[PDB]
Each structure stands twice: as C-alpha cells, then as structure tokens.
Amino acid sequence: SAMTVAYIAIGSNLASPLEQVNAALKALGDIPESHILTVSSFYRTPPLGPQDQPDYLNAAVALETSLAPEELLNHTQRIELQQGRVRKRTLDLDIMLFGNEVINTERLTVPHYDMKNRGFMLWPLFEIAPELVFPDGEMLRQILHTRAFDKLNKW
Numbered sequence: 001s002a003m004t005v006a007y008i009a010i011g012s013n014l015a016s017p018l019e020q021v022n023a024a025l026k027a028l029g030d031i032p033e034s035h036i037l038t039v040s041s042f043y044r045t046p047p048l049g050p051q052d053q054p055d056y057l058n059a060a061v062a063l064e065t066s067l068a069p070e071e072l073l074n075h076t077q078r079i080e081l082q083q084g085r086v087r088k089r090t091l092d093l094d095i096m097l098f099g100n101e102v103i104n105t106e107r108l109t110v111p112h113y114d115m116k117n118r119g120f121m122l123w124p125l126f127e128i129a130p131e132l133v134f135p136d137g138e139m140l141r142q143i144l145h146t147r148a149f150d151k152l153n154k155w
C-alpha cells in the first residue's frame, strides 16, 4: 500500500526538554514502515494553560508511512509512555494530519480538532510544508496570512 505523509506535532515542557524531543525523533524514525521526511526547527513557546509551568519546546515532523492511522497512533502513544509520560508533561505527540484523511473515531480525530487555532502547530508546519492544503480545502498559507498569531522564537 501507498505511503501517506503524516504530520505530527511534538511538545515538551519539562524544565529541561531538548533530550525528550531528540529521543522522540529517534523513536519516530524507528517506527516500522515509516520514515521521517522532514523536521521543523525547534521553537520555544510560552505555556498556554492556567498553571505556572516551563516554556514548551514545540516542533513538527513529516513522517511518510504505510501504517494505518490508528496503528501510527499506537506507536506515538507507546513512545510517549516509554519516555515516561505519566497521567495525572514529558512528551506530547499529536497527529495533526494523516494525508488527506478525515478520521473521527473514539481514539482518533484527524485533522487535530484545534490545530487551526494554534500558532505553535501552524508555524512549524508551514516551515516543513508551506504548500499544504487541509482536507477541507483551506490553505495553510492563507490561514497564516489572515489570522493573528504571534511569531515563534527558536529554541
């Protein structure tokens, strides 16, 4: 079966997160039937949320894969857990896009339900996929031209 390009958001806001992120990239690259095509720059983003916490390291990866979408989710969940993610964050791997697919299942909603509202997703995505068009036809470039998002600082 043909390869699909999936786009995965990476976040960590450990007080020291660069090692989580680099370990995640290595793990993502070892996923079967999959290969990293591109990685964005790393960005330092102020934390969104009510609690006092460290800044996030945010990034995006393009992963070419012939896995089924839920199978890719199995791997991203395994990586988060194997890197010490404990639910009450060490690592967060969100599947933003899985080619052109629109998925609404119990475990998996693609496109990511809020990504069009998140500069820390859209800017890294634009760096690696400037010509991207969403499944509904919206162009990434047009969203970033029109809507107000802060620019990100590099990590």
Ligand SMILES: Nc1ncnc2c1ncn2[C@@H]1O[C@H](COP(=O)(O)OP(=O)(O)OP(=O)(O)O)[C@@H](O)[C@H]1O
Binding pocket: 092, 093, 094, 095, 096, 106, 107, 108, 109, 110, 111, 112, 114
């Ligand atoms: N596109 C997706 N990528 C990753 N997980 C997803 C996706 N869609 C649904 N899920 C499901 O989301 C559940 C909750 O994950 P999580 O607690 O990481 O949310 P979050 O990343 O903190 O918040 P947000 O989604 O608003 O960024 C997972 O158990 C997983 O089954």
Ligand SMILES: N#Cc1ccccc1CSc1nc2c(=O)nc(N)[nH]c2[nH]1
Binding pocket: 010, 011, 012, 045, 046, 047, 048, 049, 050, 056, 058, 118, 120
């Ligand atoms: N509440 C909350 C909330 C508010 C906006 C977006 C996402 C969340 C969900 S938790 C969260 N994740 C990240 C991240 O990856 N990067 C930054 N900068 N802030 C973050 N907050």
Ligand SMILES: [Ca+2]
Binding pocket: 092, 093, 094
């Ligand atoms: Ca998540």
Ligand SMILES: [Ca+2]
Binding pocket: 011, 092, 094
């Ligand atoms: Ca998230």
Ligand SMILES: [Ca+2]
Binding pocket: 117
């Ligand atoms: Ca919002």
Ligand SMILES: [Ca+2]
Binding pocket: 111, 134, 135, 136, 137
């Ligand atoms: Ca869409």
